[PDB]
Design a protein around this ligand. Structure first.
Ligand SMILES: Nc1ncnc2c1ncn2[C@@H]1O[C@H](COP(=O)(O)OP(=O)(O)O)[C@@H](O)[C@H]1O
Ligand SMILES: [Mg+2]
Lengths: 574, 619
C-alpha cells in the first residue's frame, strides 16, 4: 500500500503546523497522565513512610493541578486534530473533483457515474476519518511508551531496564501479528465487497433470474461467496485473538518481575516502595494505550484500498485538452469536413470508424444512418471532441478540430445527446444552460419551436415548474423536447442531434423539424437517427454500416442505389 | 425507529440459540478469565505489602515486639507514625523475608499466565460462534430473497431492499460481536472490580461510584448537545452527493454548454460548508473521552489522597491501596467507551429488526409439482382481470388466442397494459378470475420452474450481472460450449459490435469504458434468450433501442423462420409488427380490435388512426 502514503503526505501539506500542535499536546496530555503515579509515589514516599499527614493533603493540590492541565491540553488536542483532519479530506475531494472535471467522455465513462461518486464523496471519507483517528487516539501508544520509558528513567533509573525490555517486545509481538494479519484483513474487504455485488446483482435482476428459472445457479454461486467470506474472516479473527492476550501477558509478566526486581533493590535501600506504585501504573497505562490503539488497526486495510482507488482516479492523465497554439477563428460557422476519420479502441480487432469521409455545406442538413453499433454513435461525439480520432481529420471551415480551442468549439455547437439529462432545479434554470442570459420571451420561443409549450405554459407559475434531479418526472419525449429547446436557444452554428427525435412520435418530430428549418435557415444541422421518416427531408444522407460509409447522397438518389439503405427503408412503410 | 427493543433483542439472541454450548463456553470462560485478572492485583499487593512490612520494620529495635514498639513510637511524639505501625503486621528485627515474596510472585505469575491462555481460547470460540451464526443469517436472507413475490420488490423505493441485506447484516455483525466480547466483559470489569473494590475499603469505593453518574451525565449531555450538528452534517454530505451525482451523470452536458466554472463554483461553496459542518460534528464527538477521563481522574486523585491519609492513620494497608489504584484504573475504562458501546448497540439493533421484518413476510404460492410441457402452444386467455391494488383495474376482460406456430403481436399506447400482460403470462403476478391456458393445460396449477424455464422472455430493461459478455450470453444455457454460444449469439448480431470492443467476449460488463449503448446491451439479452432455445418466446418491447432493420432480421431468423414455436412480439414500432400474424391493439386493457394487418387496416379503427400518428404524421 505505497499509494496511501503518497496520497497522504501530498494533501495534508498546509496542516504541518496544525498537526505539530496536536503531536505536542498529546505529549503534554500523556506526560500529565503518567505523572499522576509519579506523584502518588511521593504520597507513598514523603507522606506515608513518615507521619507527615500534612504533606499528602498539601500535595493533592499538585495532583489536581496536573489532572486539570491533562484535560486543558486533551480537549485542545481533539480540537486541532479534527480540524486539520477536516481541512484534509476537504482538500482531497476538492482535488479529486477538479481532476475529474478534466476527464473526457472516454475516461469518465471508464469509471462511471456511481463508481466515480463513491470514489469522491464516500471514498475520501475513509482517509479523512483515518487521519482524525491516528492523530488523537492512535499516536497515544508510541507517545505513552516513550514517555513511560523516560519517566522510568527519571525515577530510579536503575530499574528502568525492565521497561526498556518490556517495550521492544510489546511492540514487536504486536507488530508480527499485524504483519501476519494485514494481508488476510485486506483479503477480507475485497471478499465482503464481492458478496454485496452478488446480492446487488441478484436483487436488481430478480425478474430475469426467475425468467430463466435460474435459481439453482443462484444461492449456489452465493453459497461459494458466503462460506468463503466466513473463511477469510474466521482466519483474520484467528490472528486478532492474539492481540489482547499477548499484550496483557507481556505487561502482567513485566509487572510480576517488577516486584521481584524492585524488592531486590529496596532490600539494599536504594529504592522506595512508592516507586513500585508508579511503575505498576506506568505498565497499566502503556497496556491501556496499546490495546485501544491496536483494537482499531482495521482502518488501515480498509483505507488502503480506498487510497488505491482515489489514486487510480488521480493518476488518470487526460488525453483531450487545449493545444499549445489553438487558432481563434473570428467565426466557426458550420462547415464539417470529415476526411479519413477513424476511431479505434486500445487492443480492439475492428475500429469503431474506418475511413469515413463527408463534407457538409454551410447551412444545409446532413443525416447519418446505419444499424445498431455501426459506428454512427461516436460520429456526433467526434465532432464536438468527446473522443479523439486515431488516424483521421475532421475540420470546421478553417482548421482541424483538435487544432482548435475546445471551449470556443463548444460555444457554437448546440448538442442534444442520446439521453436528455435535466438538472435539478427549475425549468427557468434547467434550460437556462443554453444561453444563460436569455430573456423571458426568448425561453418561450424555444419551447414553441421544440413543440414544448403545451406542458410548460399549462402550469400556475409558467416557465418555473419544479423538475426532478435527473428530470425523471418528465417521462419521455417531454424530457427530449426540453433538451431540444435547451439546444434551440443558443443561436448555434451547428445543431448536433444524436438519437434525439427517436422518443417523439412522427407528428411532433415533423413539427420540430419544420420549426428548426424555419429558424435555422443558416445553421448547419447533423441529425443521427434510426428512422427514415425523419431523414427524408435532410439535404444529404449518408449510410454507414460496420463502420465504413457505404453510400452518400439524398433520399431519392440512394433508395434505389444501395441495398442497405433500401432494406432500411423497407421496414418503415405500412 | 426500532418500534420494538425487548422482542427484537430476544429474537437476535435466540438467533444465537443453536450455538448454546459454544456460547456458555464463552460466557463461563470469560468469567473465569476476568475473575482471575482481578484477584491478581490482590496477590501483587500482598507481595508489595510483605516488602513494606519488612522495609519499614527491620530498623526497629530487635527484641522489641509490635505492641511495645508502637507504644514507644507514640511515647516519643510520633503519633501518626505509631498509627501507621499499628496499621499493618510487622515484627521488629526481621528483614524482607524474600521467600514469602517469591512464593507470592510465583502464584501471581501462575494465574497471570492462566489468564492469557484463558482469554485467547475465549476469543477464538467467540469468533467461531459469530462467523457460524452469521452464515446462517446471510443464507436465510438469500433463501428468503428467492421466495418473496415480485410485488414485495417493486413496491419499495430504489435502494431500500438493497440496503437491508448488505449494509443491514454488517451492523448485526458489529452489534453481536461487540455485545458478547466488548460489552459482556465491560460489565464484569464493573461488577467484579467493584465486589473486590468493596472488600478493601468501603469509604474509598464510594469516591469512584459517584463518578459513574458524573460520567454518564456528561457523556449524555455531550451526545444530546452534538445532535444539531451530527444531523446538520449528514444533511450536508447528502447535498454534496446530490450535486456531485448530477454533475457526473450529466457530464457531457456540463462540458458542452461550458458551465464547468459554474459547476465548480457550486461545489466549492458547498464543500467549504460541509467541511465546517463536519468539523463540529467530529470535535463534539471526539471530546466525549477527553471529558469522561477528566472524571476518571477526579476520582483517582481523591482515591489516592484518601488512601494515603488512611494508610497514614493505620486504618488500611499499603498493599491494599496498591491494588485499589489498579482497580480504579480498570473501573475507569468501562466508561470511556460507553458512548461507543451504546450508540453502536442501539444502531445495530435498530438496523436489526429490518432483517426480521424482511424474514417475517409472506412467501410465494407454494407451487404444485406438475412439470407442464409445451407441445405446440395454445396460450389462450379467458377473461383475465388482473389488478395491482383493489379499486384500480388495469387489465379488463380479454380473451386473446394464438396459433401453435404463429407470432401473435401486441401494440398500444404507453401504459396500455402490455408489460404486465407478459408478467401475467410469466406468473410473476396472480391472475384474477381468469384462465391463462397455455397449450390446453392451465398454468395456474403448474410448478413455476417448469413454466418459466419453458417460456423464454426478454424485456425492455436489460440485466447484465458482473461478468464477461460471454458469461452473460451463456447465462441462458450454462452447459453450452463456446461453439454453441457464439453460434447462437451471432444470430442476434452481437459480433458486429463486440469485435469492435477492446477485448471482445471478455469485456466484463460491470465496469467498462461505456462502449455499449442501449441497443447493443439489448442484443446481448436477445442472444441470451436464443441460448436457452425457448419454445414460447416473448419479446416485451425488446427492440426499442436497436435498429429497426436489425430487429426485422432477428425476428425473421429466430421468430418467423421458427415454424415450430410461437412468440409474442410486443413493440411500439408498427413497421416491425405489420404482416405479423394477428396484431392486437390494447388501450388500458380492453382489446379494441384484432386480426391480421389487412383486416385490421381495412376497417379504420384505432389501429388505422394509430398508424396515421406513426406514418401520416398527424397528432
Ligand atoms: N407492480 C406495480 N405496482 C404498482 N403500480 C404498477 C405496477 N406495475 C405497473 N404499475 C403502474 O400501472 C400502470 C399500467 O401500465 P403498464 O401495464 O405498465 O403499461 P406499459 O407496460 O405499456 O407501461 C403503469 O403506468 C404503472 O405505473
Ligand atoms: Mg410496457
Amino acid at each position: 500500500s505505497n499509494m496511501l502514503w503518497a496520497l497522504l503526505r501530498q494533501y495534508v501539506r498546509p496542516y504541518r503546523w496544525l498537526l505539530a500542535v496536536v503531536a505536542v499536546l498529546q505529549v503534554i496530555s500523556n506526560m500529565a497522565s503518567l505523572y499522576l503515579p509519579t506523584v502518588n509515589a511521593a504520597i507513598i514516599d514523603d507522606g506515608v513512610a513518615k507521619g507527615d499527614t500534612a504533606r499528602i493533603v498539601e500535595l493533592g493540590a499538585v495532583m489536581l493541578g496536573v489532572t486539570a492541565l491533562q484535560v486543558v491540553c486533551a480537549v485542545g488536542a481533539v480540537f486541532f486534530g479534527a480540524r486539520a483532519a477536516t481541512g484534509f479530506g476537504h482538500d482531497l475531494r476538492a482535488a479529486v473533483f477538479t481532476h475529474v472535471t478534466t476527464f473526457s467522455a472516454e475516461e469518465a465513462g471508464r469509471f462511471g457515474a456511481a463508481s466515480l461518486l463513491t470514489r469522491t464523496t464516500n471514498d475520501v471519507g475513509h482517509i479523512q476519518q483515518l487521519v482524525q483517528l491516528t492523530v488523537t487516539m492512535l499516536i497515544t501508544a508510541p507517545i505513552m511508551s516513550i514517555g513511560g520509558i523516560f519517566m522510568a528513567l527519571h525515577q530510579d533509573a536503575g530499574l528502568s531496564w525492565l521497561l526498556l525490555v518490556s517495550v521492544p517486545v510489546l511492540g514487536l509481538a504486536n507488530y508480527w501479528i499485524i504483519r501476519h494479519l494485514m494481508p488476510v484483513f485486506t483479503r477480507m474487504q475485497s471478499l465482503i465487497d464481492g458478496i454485496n455485488r452478488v446480492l446487488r446483482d441478484q436483487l436488481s435482476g430478480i425478474r430475469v433470474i426467475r425468467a430463466f428459472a435460474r435459481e439453482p445457479l443462484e444461492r449456489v454461486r452465493f453459497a461459494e461467496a458466503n462460506q468463503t467470506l466466513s473463511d477469510s474472516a474466521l482466519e483474520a479473527g484467528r490472528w486478532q485473538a492474539l492481540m489482547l492476550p499477548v499484550t496483557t501477558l507481556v505487561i502482567n509478566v513485566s509487572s510480576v518481575a517488577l516486584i521481584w526486581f524492585g524488592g531486590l533493590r529496596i532490600d539494599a535501600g536504594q529504592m522506595q516502595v512508592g516507586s513500585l506504585i508508579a511503575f505498576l501504573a506506568y505498565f497499566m497505562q502503556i497496556l491501556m494505550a496499546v490495546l485501544m490503539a491496536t483494537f482499531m488497526l482495521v482502518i488501515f486495510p480498509r483505507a488502503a484500498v480506498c487510497a488505491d482507488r482515489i489514486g487510480e482516479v488521480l493518476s488518470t492523465q487526460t488525453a483531450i485538452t487545449n493545444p499549445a497554439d489553438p487558432v481563434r477563428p473570428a467565426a466557426i460557422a458550420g462547415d464539417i469536413g470529415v476526411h479519413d476519420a477513424t476511431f479505434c479502441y486500445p487492443g480492439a480487432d475492428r475500429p469503431v470508424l474506418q475511413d469515413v469521409s463527408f463534407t457538409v455545406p454551410r447551412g444545409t442538413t446532413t443525416a447519418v444512418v446505419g444499424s445498431t453499433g455501426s459506428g454512427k454513435s461516436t460520429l456526433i461525439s467526434l465532432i464536438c471532441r468527446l473522443y479523439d480520432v486515431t488516424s483521421g481529420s475532421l475540420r470546421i471551415d478553417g482548421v482541424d478540430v483538435r487544432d482548435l480551442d475546445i471551449e470556443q468549439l463548444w460555444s457554437a455547437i448546440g448538442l442534444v445527446p442520446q439521453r436528455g439529462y435535466l438538472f435539478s432545479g427549475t425549468v427557468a434554470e434547467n434550460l437556462r444552460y443554453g444561453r444563460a442570459d436569455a430573456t423571458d420571451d426568448e425561453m418561450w420561443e424555444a419551447l414553441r419551436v421544440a413543440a414544448a409549450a403545451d406542458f410548460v405554459r399549462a402550469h400556475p407559475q409558467g416557465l418555473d415548474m419544479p423538475v426532478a434531479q435527473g428530470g425523471i418526472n418528465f417521462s419521455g419525449g417531454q424530457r427530449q423536447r426540453l433538451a431540444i429547446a435547451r439546444a434551440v436557444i443558443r443561436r448555434p452554428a451547428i445543431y448536433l442531434f444524436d438519437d434525439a427525435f427517436s422518443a417523439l412520435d412522427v407528428h411532433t418530430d415533423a413539427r420540430v423539424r419544420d420549426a428548426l428549418r424555419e429558424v435555422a435557415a443558416d445553421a448547419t444541422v447533423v441529425i443521427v437517427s434510426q428512422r427514415i421518416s425523419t431523414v427524408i427531408e435532410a439535404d444529404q444522407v449518408v449510410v454507414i454500416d460496420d463502420g465504413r460509409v457505404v453510400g452518400i447522397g439524398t433520399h431519392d438518389t440512394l433508395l434505389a442505389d444501395c441495398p442497405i439503405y433500401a432494406e432500411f427503408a423497407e421496414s418503415q412503410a405500412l | 425507529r426500532t418500534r420494538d427493543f425487548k422482542g427484537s433483542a430476544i429474537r437476535l439472541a435466540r438467533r444465537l440459540l443453536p450455538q448454546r454450548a459454544l456460547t456458555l463456553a464463552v460466557i463461563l470462560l470469560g468469567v473465569g478469565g476476568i475473575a482471575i485478572g482481578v484477584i491478581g492485583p490482590r496477590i501483587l499487593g500482598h507481595a508489595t505489602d510483605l516488602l513494606f512490612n519488612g522495609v519499614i520494620g527491620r530498623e526497629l529495635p530487635a527484641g522489641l515486639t509490635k505492641e511495645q514498639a508502637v507504644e514507644a513510637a507514640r511515647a516519643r511524639g510520633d503519633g501518626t507514625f505509631a498509627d501507621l505501625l499499628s496499621g499493618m503486621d510487622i515484627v521488629p528485627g526481621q528483614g524482607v523475608d524474600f521467600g514469602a515474596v517469591g512464593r507470592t510472585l510465583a502464584l501471581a505469575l501462575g494465574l497471570y499466565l492462566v489468564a492469557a491462555l484463558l482469554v485467547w481460547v475465549q476469543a477464538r470460540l467467540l469468533n467461531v460462534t459469530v462467523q457460524r451464526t452469521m452464515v446462517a443469517l446471510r443464507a436465510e436472507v438469500q433463501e428468503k430473497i428467492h421466495r418473496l413475490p415480485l410485488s414485495y420488490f417493486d413496491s419499495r423505493q430504489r435502494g431500500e431492499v438493497l440496503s437491508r441485506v448488505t449494509n443491514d447484516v454488517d451492523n448485526i455483525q458489529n452489534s453481536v460481536s461487540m455485545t458478547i466480547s466488548q460489552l459482556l466483559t465491560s460489565v464484569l470489569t464493573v461488577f467484579a472490580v467493584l465486589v473486590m473494590m468493596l472488600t478493601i475499603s468501603p469509604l474509598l469505593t464510594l469516591f469512584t461510584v459517584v463518578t459513574v453518574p458524573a460520567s454518564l451525565w456528561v457523556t449524555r449531555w455531550i451526545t444530546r448537545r452534538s445532535q444539531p450538528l451530527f444531523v446538520a452534517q449528514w444533511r450536508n454530505t447528502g447535498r454534496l452527493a446530490a450535486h456531485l451525482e448530477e454533475t457526473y451523470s450529466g457530464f457531457t452536458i456540463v462540458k458542452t454548454f461550458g458551465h464547468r466554472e459554474a459547476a465548480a463554483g457550486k461545489f466549492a461553496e458547498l464543500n467549504s460548508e460541509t467541511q465546517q459542518s463536519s468539523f463540529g460534528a467530529q470535535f463534539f464527538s471526539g471530546l466525549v473521552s477527553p471529558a469522561t477521563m477528566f472524571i476518571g481522574n477526579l476520582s483517582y486523585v481523591a482515591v489516592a489522597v484518601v488512601g494515603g491519609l488512611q494508610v497514614a492513620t493505620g486504618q488500611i494497608t499499603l498493599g491494599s491501596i496498591q491494588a485499589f489504584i489498579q482497580y480504579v484504573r480498570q473501573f475507569n475504562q468501562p466508561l470511556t467507551q460507553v458512548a461507543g458501546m451504546y450508540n453502536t448497540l442501539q444502531s445495530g439493533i435498530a438496523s436489526a429488526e429490518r432483517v426480521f421484518d424482511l424474514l417475517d413476510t409472506e412467501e410465494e404460492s407454494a407451487d404444485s409439482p406438475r412439470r407442464a410441457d409445451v407441445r405446440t402452444g395454445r396460450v389462450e386467455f379467458e377473461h383475465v382481470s388482473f389488478s395491482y391494488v383493489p379499486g384500480t383495474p388495469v387489465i379488463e376482460d380479454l380473451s386473446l388466442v394464438a396459433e401453435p406456430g404463429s407470432t401473435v403481436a401486441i401494440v398500444g399506447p404507453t401504459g396500455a397494459g402490455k408489460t404486465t400482460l407478459v408478467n401475467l403470462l410469466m406468473r410473476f403476478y396472480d391472475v384474477d378470475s381468469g384462465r391463462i391456458t397455455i397449450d390446453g393445460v392451465d398454468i395456474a396449477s403448474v410448478s413455476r420452474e417448469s413454466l418459466r424455464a419453458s417460456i423464454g422472455m426478454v424485456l425492455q430493461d436489460t440485466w447484465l450481472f458482473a461478468g464477461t459478455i460471454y458469461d452473460n450470453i451463456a447465462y441462458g444455457r450454462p452447459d453450452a460450449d463456446e461453439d454453441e454460444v457464439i453460434e447462437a449469439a451471432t444470430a442476434a448480431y452481437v459480433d458486429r459490435f463486440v469485435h469492435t470492443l477492446p477485448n471482445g467476449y471478455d469485456t466484463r460488463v460491470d465496469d467498462d469504458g461505456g462502449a455499449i449503448s442501449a441497443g447493443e446491451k439489448q442484443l446481448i439479452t436477445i442472444a441470451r434468450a436464443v441460448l436457452a432455445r425457448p419454445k414460447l418466446l416473448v419479446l416485451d418491447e425488446a427492440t426499442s433501442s436497436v435498429d429497426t432493420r436489425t430487429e426485422l432480421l432477428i425476428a425473421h431468423a429466430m421468430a418467423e423462420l421458427r415454424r415450430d414455436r410461437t412468440s409474442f412480439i410486443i413493440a411500439h414500432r408498427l413497421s416491425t409488427i405489420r404482416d405479423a400474424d394477428l396484431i392486437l391493439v390494447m388501450d388500458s386493457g380492453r382489446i379494441i380490435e384484432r386480426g391480421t394487418h389487412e383486416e385490421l387496416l381495412a376497417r379504420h379503427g384505432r389501429y388505422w388512426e394509430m398508424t396515421r400518428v406513426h406514418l401520416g404524421g398527424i397528432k
